[PDB]
Amino acid sequence: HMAIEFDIQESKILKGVYIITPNKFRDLRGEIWTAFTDEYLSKLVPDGIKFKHDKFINSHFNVLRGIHGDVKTYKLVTCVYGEVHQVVVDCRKDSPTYLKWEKFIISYKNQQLILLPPNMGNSHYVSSAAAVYYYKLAYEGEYMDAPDQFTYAWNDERIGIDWPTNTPILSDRDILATK
Amino acid sequence: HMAIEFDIQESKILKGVYIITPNKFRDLRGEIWTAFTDEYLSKLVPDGIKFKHDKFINSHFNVLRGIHGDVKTYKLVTCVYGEVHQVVVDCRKDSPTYLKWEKFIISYKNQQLILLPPNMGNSHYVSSAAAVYYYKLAYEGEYMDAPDQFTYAWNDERIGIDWPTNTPILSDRDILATK
Ligand SMILES: Nc1nc2c(ncn2[C@@H]2O[C@H](COP(=O)(O)OP(=O)(O)O[C@H]3O[C@@H]([C@H](O)CO)[C@H](O)[C@@H](O)[C@@H]3O)[C@@H](O)[C@H]2O)c(=O)[nH]1
Numbered sequence A, B: 001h002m003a004i005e006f007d008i009q010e011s012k013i014l015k016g017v018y019i020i021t022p023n024k025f026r027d028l029r030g031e032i033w034t035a036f037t038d039e040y041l042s043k044l045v046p047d048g049i050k051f052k053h054d055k056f057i058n059s060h061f062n063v064l065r066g067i068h069g070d071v072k073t074y075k076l077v078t079c080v081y082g083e084v085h086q087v088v089v090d091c092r093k094d095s096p097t098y099l100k101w102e103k104f105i106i107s108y109k110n111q112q113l114i115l116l117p118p119n120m121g122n123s124h125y126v127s128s129a130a131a132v133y134y135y136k137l138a139y140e141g142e143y144m145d146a147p148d149q150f151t152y153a154w155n156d157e158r159i160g161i162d163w164p165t166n167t168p169i170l171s172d173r174d175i176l177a178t179k
């Protein structure tokens, strides 16, 4: 049988961003795979800080969500249906790579989970008809909702993300940040 | 801004099976929702038994997986893409409802998360073109893989489940159960 395996490597662009590739069992039915075990992936986050919250974000084609982060939250993110351009921005003002970025195109053929430490910009664009984005959160205290998060404009010129469109679907939050 | 909520109901058919319905933030982009927090949902399993394992199962139209269980795993399951016929079977030998079953028809339009204690039969049938099934596991010690699990035939006449097909796509494991 297959053991649960995770390939783990750090980004060559953004210090403290990890790229995790699970193995999969494939057969005539489809696929089974493990996104997370405490035993293997709890080490991606400091001791005392627990993955205690799981979310799904379901978005249509051409939706762009971002760029969003908060001071508290370690994020393990992936796309479990469809295809997203996942873009991590370095939003640590102290970092020598502040406002550098790296793209992961996550889909049926590239199943990566991306580990974001706090003070990072998270963003994704939906290149498939629809996308199911899976989002694990590790944080102390209460959930950091939108009023406690920071926002950079998806198209901030200082960041210069290569997006597949100039005309994404945006929430009012993400529109407001472009002005 | 929305507070995270869970409607938590006990099954009227199978004691110790709970139906958890999250609320969702719906906007022009699609939806955002919480499947799990340690706070709200750790109280539905014994003290010292932790949800520590996250699985995704992607299946084609007409796949049936089941009926499967093991002696120690608590399971939280839903369908996050497409639609499944989710069937829980009471496989607790001493239970008054042994081999009774209950069906749920789960999709983003009916976002039920089903909590199964150990010694239950879990099964799903994909009625959509494809489905993604999200599976969270609470257990002590090591994972019970297929060889450490039990199996009941999907079409076992003592259970008598109504399925929308006589010709599901099955693993050799699930065909073997029908002999
Ligand atoms: N019922 C329910 N409602 C929820 C939930 N989460 C947020 N909400 C509500 O959704 C609304 C929109 O919340 P937003 O946080 O602005 O949604 P958003 O999807 O635009 O932003 C999200 O973007 C992510 C990335 O940038 C893209 O992958 C960030 O990782 C994440 O931290 C951020 O929350 C708010 O009103 C909030 O209170 C939830 O889990 N349940």
Ligand SMILES: Nc1nc2c(ncn2[C@@H]2O[C@H](COP(=O)(O)OP(=O)(O)O[C@H]3O[C@@H]([C@H](O)CO)[C@H](O)[C@@H](O)[C@@H]3O)[C@@H](O)[C@H]2O)c(=O)[nH]1
Pocket: A001, A002, A003, A004, A005, A023, A024, A025, A032, A033, A034, B055, B057, B065, B066, B067, B068, B069, B075, B122, B123, B124, B133, B145, B146, B149, B171, B173
């Ligand atoms: N790489 C990787 N491989 C995994 C994994 N899980 C199982 N496998 C392997 O997939 C193969 C098939 O595993 P099975 O356990 O028979 O898959 P299955 O999808 O037929 O069975 C599953 O069915 C569920 C319900 O009945 C339907 O929702 C049960 O609740 C669940 O406990 C059971 O494992 C085995 O070789 C196993 O070692 C995994 O997480 N990663």
